[PDB]
Design a binder for this molecule. Structure first.
Ligand SMILES: Nc1ncnc2c1ncn2[C@@H]1O[C@H](COP(=O)(O)OP(=O)(O)OP(=O)(O)O)[C@@H](O)[C@H]1O
Ligand SMILES: [Mg+2]
Ligand SMILES: [Mg+2]
Lengths: 373, 273, 179, 330, 409, 119
């Protein structure tokens, strides 16, 4: 609740003092180093014409006009900076040095409200950038006890206005389930308090629970038994490593089991298609000796490529998704060694060890005897 | 050469400094466009200052110097090249000897010969000429005039060399305790970081039970004083173990002779050294 | 005089055999086993249908973005020379009927398949598969394989082999095909 | 075994550590750059000058035979022991140009390519071909192959590529550029290979377009032109004398005491960190103890006093040539 | 919330979740909606039928997979938004902007702000859904690309008559977990089982199989009867390829078309009413997948010597000529290859013919090296290695009558 | 300003976030490498749950952390992982695998153990 508190303060002041300040919003992910200069001049020409050019020319002439403007009453230039940790680079903080200079030396009232996620934001600044700062770091409070989450949910589902005849009946049902700790609403709140402890996270399930109700009778039923809440929790954990194993056939499970035994008995866990086919072939002849159709080597290629797309076999010493866009361009122009070698000699890694496969497989399956080693 | 934009465009500047502005201004690309202009002509003398910056910071680096050397070696033309670098067709190398004590003293009297009265002493210029062994001598003599005129000889030359153990006495007793633990962690662990130096300083002051400890957030404030004065150098390197990640390492740059002599005079700290 | 007549006769039967298999919601893959990418493919001039032959080289194909930009430049240049600036992407293929009025029949000729990277060629086939929902665009790929049909199969994904197998034919034309 | 495949596995035995030698470049006599060229130019013009001139006259009789192969579309590729720079410039100009211009009735222009120079780009070579004949480079040659097919057979441009084994020619971008031009029956290709892996560069698709003809002409040339492109003389004996000459008077005294102390017992490990401070106590040279870092950071930049703390320093330099340095600084 | 919820097969929970978020009122519509789900889960089918039954919602479809780089993605957003708003309200005179001027993430905010200012003449707030079918399928993908799109609504003016709505359809799972702290209502899509896959293919392929040209020409040479025939072939294909394909829809749809003409021609006047005799007559269409649809003498021997130098140590080579195959091959030298090649060659010096076959061996990608683009064969630091599997090198040595399995035994 | 909000931040976290920090510190006292992979933290968390599985007091939390109190939800093997990364406390290298990905601590080790004992 960082941007939500800042948006409420701007709306409260706009209902009385709408001609005394402007709104200048900035982002750390969208605006880069060079685009941050043009973003300030662009938001200034559109806000000055609304109360009663700047962003004209090259990049050098734009920054020159900004310093000549910021550096009966005045106009407060409220600066809303989002994700300020990206601009606090250890190489140079040009924008952070000029923004803080518009507070102490400059006479124009400039209110900078930075929003970041790093707890140690004081060390990310330079020696001169931190000198111009007032060291005003307001930490956002979190949920401590259990009664803090109950009062927040009650205030989000209580209609304090006479806009529907079912308002008086809905407030009695919500207050009855919340005051009783043995109800179903208090159980889901306590479960999310020790697992997530986030208000927007728990709000993702209350919204579809009310919209799916057809009438008032269906709303009071779903709010008392919480039947729809259990379905939402199962869907969120249906496409992970556990839900993907139940959607596999008999051959897709035999390949992943045989490939797990090779990486487990090895030293570094390296294996390829040739090592996985040797364990699968020795398992079919061992079971039938005590009829499973043994597939040829030309048919396992389609099953091997299907498990890679399903996030199960990761390449050995592979970075994968890059952080920023700089490392993503250099990695695309360089041809990796795994693309030149054939598919039967590519070193892969298992995303799940054999110890975890024995717990998510029931005893009714016939492939349970080959998961102990 | 340093007052240019590109090192490859050095042939165009010579054309603008020789050809008249009333005639047609031609464009010069390289050697083929500059040699044909000096064919009909008149001794063209050029002074290329600081030729060491003409390289492209071995095959492609030595290109502008090798091209300009070949232009002033072939006959049929008349183009001389005199460069002033900084320390069978090879140029005549002349090493400029530095000025000594007797060489710097003659230039002072020769430069100030136009002045009617000389307020300098013959024994004061002899000390500044030997201690500076020409640009360094000018800053010494100029500093003595500004100092003497701000407070209102032989002692005037000694004050310019002293006004421009001291860094330790300018610190507090609390900053000396952390500094003593910084060099101590670098002796029993060689490469150490800021996180490892803070743990060694806390465990070293707990056995003595003197002075209150400080948090990790305020630990960087003391190290910042040593970096501004010139006693602790903090750089950014990597690790050498299994987790070779980017981390901030701490280092020093002081002598061990002066360190084991200033803190021992207070006679209040012994196990911290 | 007889050698030059034989060389001219080699390309004569090669241009007739390729055109006989090119025009007689899938890709028309034609594998040219034993081709050094030195044959000039000439398409027919049928009415109400514009045919464009796009030749892709491994040197001019460094990535996927440059593969689509170079293919759209030759398409817009060939259609304008027969009979307003547009972007060089897949939007030109979709808006080909609204800007010209005739059908589209792109014939891709991948020169030197063994010298190109397989990680880039796989993404180009999947990107061109979305042009089948236009009901007026037909893409025909031509590969000049110089090794074997088994070496070019292991370097592709399962979604690429099954897609091109809907209408793929073999046409071995080496330097000594049957002596 | 010495020859055949048996000689490869017999001459690569596992040599023991104690059986190896420790002879470096310290015992070898040091030479300068002025005396290196005077002797080289003397041995390349007098030693075996008569057998080299007599052998060159024998290969000169093959000049009409080389021209007969270029008229039929067969490109020439000379090889052997030594360089072929003097053999190509004397044949492709003083014999190939007058004979061609007098058989198809100015002279025929010849484009000499410097393959030994690493700075031979592929965009500057094609610029002279278009201006004399009248990837955009590869697409331009393909448009001229079919255009020159209907033209009559008449040699108009001679390509004399020198050294077909340098770093610039061995690149795959430049090779295919020259093979496509060799298919033209109106352009003569005269190359010369020196590396032993010459046929490894071209394959079956490149040999048919090149149509090269091998001609062994081992003239045993010392190769004086291509030898001036690499660092043949390749920590600086003559370079260290110019550093001390530009320094001050007090700077030369600091290096004189370090050399005399290090060269006293070459088995002294060198000069310790605190050992250098003891020399200042007997000779007023430096200021105090904190001034040692001002002179230590300057000597290590010119490569003259390497550090090797197990602070004991030791510069990798023998005492054979170090004794002569004390006489110059004195 | 006034909207119509369509009826989707085996997607009762997924269809109800879309109606709880997507609405015509921006006050009860979230700014972000991720539709995570792997291939063959029905993400596009549950979205097209949801927007076709409700014509009051204006959604913009965009395929990021057709733009490769991220630069054309920013240009396609402003181009499709202006084109959609032009045909929606033709009685409003707006200014056409150049979509090619969007090259930076900041320029996208300025371009979208210059369009929403001329659409304030409306009465109620009209949503603008921007469906991004396949966000993670983009080529140049990074971890900072999704962070620039989830904060686009913050820079937009709150007092606007048209609010943008971003809809992402992810495919993998790890890409979604990287932004789990943003609290985005994600609608997962689980894969179908063996009972839902066959039921989907029946209700989607029966309308095109019984009216095909091959089946109509077979009954005249030899509508309720043709329905059970086409339904039996679909059920027999899934049960015979459930292990080869798994649960993918594209993998099973290709096998049906590849075996449909071969299954119609095997139907006579007696196999129309007896399904037992029809399965036995075409037993070759269910037991296998039917797959999918000249080397020189010196070139054959060069690949044999290259396989030995890449899978054996060179320290013991003076004892034979005078499982390591399961790992990556090793790099050797040119002179080390010609020594073994000359020993295994039957009764030859190294002439230009040997180097000619070796240069052609690298063109077909049969032997790898240390450099891919711009390789130097004359460089002494560039090594050579084999690039063929064991099954390929086994059939080559068998044609020349050479024992290649005894060297590794 | 001189106060440190890192200590009080970990004391107000949920049980899932506090268990990930306690599991990371326990792995450092066994091997001493300052580089624990992601696969070792998952195995160490499950090892602490099965310590007293026969007791009714410990099995009450196993049904929520692995099944969320539902019989239809299978036994699980991401919210608390990305939360500590943006707070400047935990670090994670760029790796496509979720088992061999090393996890390093950015804050001090002395101030991290004080928050676990306060709970
Ligand atoms: N529940 C269903 N009932 C009937 N047909 C379905 C169902 N789900 C999917 N389909 C069919 O599956 C076909 C192919 O699936 P489609 O490509 O649309 O799925 P997707 O999950 O959106 O794909 P992708 O991951 O490639 O984006 C569609 O044409 C659709 O008709
Ligand atoms: Mg925010
Ligand atoms: Mg889809």
């Amino acid at each position: 609740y960082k941007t939500y508190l800042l948006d409420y303060e701007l709306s409260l002041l706009q209902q009385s003092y709408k001609e005394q300040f402007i709104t200048i919003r900035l982002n750390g992910f969208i605006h880069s180093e060079q685009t941050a200069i043009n973003g300030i001049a662009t938001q200034l020409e559109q806000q000055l014409q609304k109360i009663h050019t700047i962003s004209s020319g090259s990049l050098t002439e734009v920054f020159e006009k900004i310093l000549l403007l910021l550096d009966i009453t005045k106009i407060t230039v409220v600066f809303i900076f989002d994700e300020i940790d990206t601009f606090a680079g250890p190489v140079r903080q040009t924008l952070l040095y000029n923004l803080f200079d518009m507070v102490e030396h400059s006479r124009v009232p400039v209110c900078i409200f930075g929003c970041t996620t790093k707890l140690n934001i004081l060390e990310y600044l330079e020696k001169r950038v931190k000198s111009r700062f007032s060291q005003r770091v307001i930490y956002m409070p979190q949920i401590q006890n259990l009664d803090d989450m109950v009062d927040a949910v009650r205030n989000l589902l209580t209609v304090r206005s006479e806009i529907s005849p079912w308002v008086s009946q809905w407030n009695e049902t919500l207050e009855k389930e919340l005051s009783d700790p043995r109800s179903n609403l208090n159980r889901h709140i306590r479960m999310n308090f020790e697992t997530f402890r986030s208000l927007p996270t728990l709000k993702n399930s209350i919204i579809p629970l009310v919209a799916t109700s057809k009438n008032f009778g269906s709303l009071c039923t779903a709010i008392k038994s919480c039947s729809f809440l259990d379905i939402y929790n199962k869907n969120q954990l249906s496409n992970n490593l556990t839900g993907r194993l139940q959607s596999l056939s008999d051959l897709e499970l035999a390949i992943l089991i045989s490939a797990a035994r090779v990486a487990l008995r090895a030293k570094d866990g390296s294996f390829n298609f040739n090592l996985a086919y040797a364990e699968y072939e020795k398992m079919i002849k061992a079971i039938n000796s005590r009829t499973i159709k043994l597939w040829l080597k030309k048919d396992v290629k389609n099953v091997w490529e299907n498990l890679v797309q399903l996030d199960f076999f990761t390449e050995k010493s592979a970075v994968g998704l890059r952080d920023n866009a700089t490392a993503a361009f250099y990695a695309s122009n360089y041809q990796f060694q795994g693309t030149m070698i054939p598919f039967d000699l590519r070193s892969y890694q298992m995303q799940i060890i054999l110890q975890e496969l024995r717990r998510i497989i029931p005893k009714s399956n016939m492939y349970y005897s080959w998961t102990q080693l | 050469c340093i007052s240019l934009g590109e090192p490859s465009s050095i042939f165009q500047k010579i054309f603008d400094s020789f050809q008249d502005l009333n005639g047609p201004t031609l464009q010069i690309k390289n050697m083929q466009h500059l040699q044909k202009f000096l064919e009909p002509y008149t001794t063209f003398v050029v002074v290329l200052d600081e030729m060491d910056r003409l390289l492209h910071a071995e095959t492609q680096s030595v290109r502008t110097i090798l091209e300009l050397f070949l232009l002033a070696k072939l006959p049929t033309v008349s183009f001389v090249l005199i460069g002033m670098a900084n320390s069978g067709l090879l140029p005549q190398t002349i090493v400029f000897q530095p000025y000594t004590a007797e060489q710097m003293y003659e230039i002072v009297i020769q430069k100030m010969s136009s002045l009617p009265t000389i307020i300098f002493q013959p024994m004061a210029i002899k000390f500044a000429a030997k201690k500076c062994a020409l640009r360094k001598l000018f800053d010494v003599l100029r500093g003595s005039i500004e100092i003497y005129e701000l407070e209102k000889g032989l002692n005037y030359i000694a004050k310019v060399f002293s006004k421009f153990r001291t860094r330790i006495a300018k610190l507090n007793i609390q900053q000396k305790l952390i500094l003593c633990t910084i060099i101590q962690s670098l002796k029993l662990n060689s490469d150490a970081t800021i996180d490892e130096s803070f743990d060694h300083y806390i465990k070293a002051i707990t056995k003595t039970d003197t002075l209150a400890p400080l948090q990790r957030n305020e630990f960087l404030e003391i190290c910042t004083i040593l970096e501004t004065c010139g006693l602790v150098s903090i750089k950014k390197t990597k690790c050498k173990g299994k987790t070779k990640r980017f981390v901030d390492k701490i280092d020093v740059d002081l002598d061990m002779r002066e360190f084991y002599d200033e803190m021992t005079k207070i006679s209040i700290l012994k196990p911290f050294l | 005089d007889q050698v030059d007549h034989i060389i001219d006769n080699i390309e004569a039967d090669l241009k007739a055999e390729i055109s006989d298999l090119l025009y007689s919601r899938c890709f028309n893959t034609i594998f040219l086993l034993g081709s050094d990418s030195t044959t000039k493919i000439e398409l027919k001039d049928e009415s109400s249908r514009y045919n464009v032959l796009i030749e892709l080289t491994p040197k001019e194909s460094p990535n996927v973005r440059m593969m689509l930009r170079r293919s759209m430049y030759k398409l817009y240049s060939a259609a304008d020379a027969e009979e307003n600036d547009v972007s060089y992407d897949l939007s030109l293929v979709e808006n080909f009927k609204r800007l010209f009025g005739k059908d589209l029949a792109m014939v891709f000729n991948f020169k030197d398949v063994d010298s190109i990277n397989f990680n880039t060629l796989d993404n180009f086939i999947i990107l061109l598969k979305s042009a089948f929902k236009y009901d007026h665009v037909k893409i025909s790929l031509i590969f000049n394989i110089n090794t074997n049909l088994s070496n070019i199969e292991k370097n592709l994904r399962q979604s690429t082999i099954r897609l091109l197998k809907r209408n793929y034919h073999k046409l071995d034309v080496s330097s000594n095909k049957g002596f | 075994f010495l020859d055949t495949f048996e000689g490869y596995f017999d001459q690569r035995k596992i040599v023991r550590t104690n059986a190896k030698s420790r002879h470096t470049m310290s015992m070898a006599p040091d030479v300068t750059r002025e005396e290196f060229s005077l002797v080289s130019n003397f041995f390349n013009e007098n030693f075996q000058k008569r057998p080299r001139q007599k052998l060159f006259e024998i290969q000169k009789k093959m000049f009409p035979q080389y021209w007969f192969e270029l008229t039929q579309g067969f490109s020439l590729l000379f090889y052997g022991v030594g360089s072929k720079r003097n053999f190509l410039e004397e044949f492709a100009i003083d014999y190939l140009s007058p004979k061609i211009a007098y058989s198809q009735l100015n002279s025929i222009p010849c484009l000499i390519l410097n393959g030994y120079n690493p700075s031979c780009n592929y965009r500057d070579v094609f610029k002279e071909i278009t201006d004399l004949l009248v990837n955009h480079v590869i697409l331009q040659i393909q448009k001229m192959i079919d255009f020159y097919k209907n033209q009559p057979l008449d040699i108009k441009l001679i390509l004399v590529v020198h050294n077909l084994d340098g770093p610039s020619i061995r690149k795959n971008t430049f090779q295919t550029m020259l093979s496509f031009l060799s298919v033209i029956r109106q352009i003569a290709i005269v190359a010369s290979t020196d590396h032993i892996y010459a046929p490894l560069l071209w394959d079956n698709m490149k040999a048919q377009n090149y149509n090269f003809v091998f001609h062994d002409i081992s003239n045993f040339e010392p190769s004086t032109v291509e030898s001036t492109f690499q660092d043949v003389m390749k920590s600086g004996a003559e370079g260290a004398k110019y550093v001390l000459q530009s320094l001050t008077v007090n700077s030369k005294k600091m290096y004189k005491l370090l050399i005399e102390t290090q060269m006293q017992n070459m088995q002294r490990t060198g000069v310790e960190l605190k050992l250098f401070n003891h020399l200042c106590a007997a000779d007023f040279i430096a200021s105090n103890e904190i001034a040692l870092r001002s002179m230590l950071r300057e000597f290590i930049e010119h490569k003259m006093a390497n550090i090797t703390k197990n602070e004991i320093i030791w510069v990798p330099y023998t005492y054979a040539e170090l004794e002569k340095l004390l006489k110059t600084v004195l | 919330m006034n909207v119509t919820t369509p009826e989707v097969a085996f997607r009762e929970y997924q269809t109800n979740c879309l109606a709880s978020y997507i609405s015509a009122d921006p006050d009860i519509t979230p700014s972000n909606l991720i539709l995570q789900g792997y291939s063959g889960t029905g993400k596009t089918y549950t979205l097209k039928k949801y927007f076709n039954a409700n014509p009051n919602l204006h959604a913009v479809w965009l395929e990021p997979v057709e733009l490769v780089s991220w630069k054309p993605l920013l240009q396609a957003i402003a181009r499709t938004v202006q084109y959609k708003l032009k045909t929606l309200y033709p009685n409003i005179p707006t200014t056409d902007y150049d979509p090619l001027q969007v090259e930076e993430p900041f320029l996208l905010v300025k371009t979208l702000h210059n369009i929403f200012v001329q659409y304030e003449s409306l009465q109620e707030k009209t949503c603008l859904f921007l469906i991004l079918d396949g966000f993670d399928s983009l080529q140049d993908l990074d971890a900072a690309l999704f962070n620039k799109y989830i904060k686009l609504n913050e820079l937009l003016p709150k007092d606007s008559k048209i609010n943008i709505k971003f809809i992402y359809t992810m495919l993998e799972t790890s890409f979604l977990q990287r932004y789990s702290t943003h609290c985005i209502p994600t609608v997962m899509f689980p894969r179908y089982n063996v009972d839902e896959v066959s039921t989907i293919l029946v209700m989607s392929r029966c309308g095109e199989l019984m009216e095909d040209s091959c089946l109509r020409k077979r009954i005249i040479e030899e509508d309720d009867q043709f329905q059970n025939v086409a339904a039996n072939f679909i059920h027999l294909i899934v049960q015979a390829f459930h292990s080869y394909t798994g649960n993918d829809i594209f993998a099973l749809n290709d096998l049906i078309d590849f075996k449909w003409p071969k299954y119609v021609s095997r139907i006579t006047k007696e196999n129309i009413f007896e399904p037992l005799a029809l399965y036995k007559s075409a037993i070759k269409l269910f037991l296998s997948t039917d797959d999918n649809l000249d080397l020189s003498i010196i070139s054959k021997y060069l690949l044999i010597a290259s396989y030995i130098c890449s899978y054996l140590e060179p320290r013991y080579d003076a004892s034979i000529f005078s499982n390591p195959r399961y790992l990556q091959p090793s790099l050797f030298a040119i002179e080390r290859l010609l020594a073994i090649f000359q020993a295994i060659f039957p009764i030859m010096k190294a002439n230009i013919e040997v180097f000619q076959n070796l240069s052609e061996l690298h063109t077909l990608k049969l032997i790898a090296t240390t450099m891919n683009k711009n390789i130097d064969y004359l460089s002494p630091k560039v090594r050579w290695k084999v690039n063929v599997p064991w099954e390929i090198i086994k059939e080559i040595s068998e044609s020349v009558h050479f024992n290649i399995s005894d060297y590794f035994s | 300003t001189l106060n440190s909000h890192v200590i009080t931040f970990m004391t107000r976290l949920s049980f899932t976030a506090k268990l990930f920090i306690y599991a990371l510190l326990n792995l450092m006292k066994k091997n001493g490498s300052q580089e624990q992979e992601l696969g070792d933290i998952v195995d160490e968390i499950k090892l602490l749950i099965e310590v007293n599985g026969s007791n009714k007091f410990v099995m009450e939390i196993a049904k929520t952390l692995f099944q969320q109190g539902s019989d239809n939800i299978s036994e699980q093997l991401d919210f608390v992982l990305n939360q500590l990364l943006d707070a400047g406390i935990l670090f994670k290298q760029t790796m496509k695998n979720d088992r061999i990905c090393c996890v390093k601590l950015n804050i001090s080790v002395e101030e991290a153990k004080r928050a676990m004992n306060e709970d």
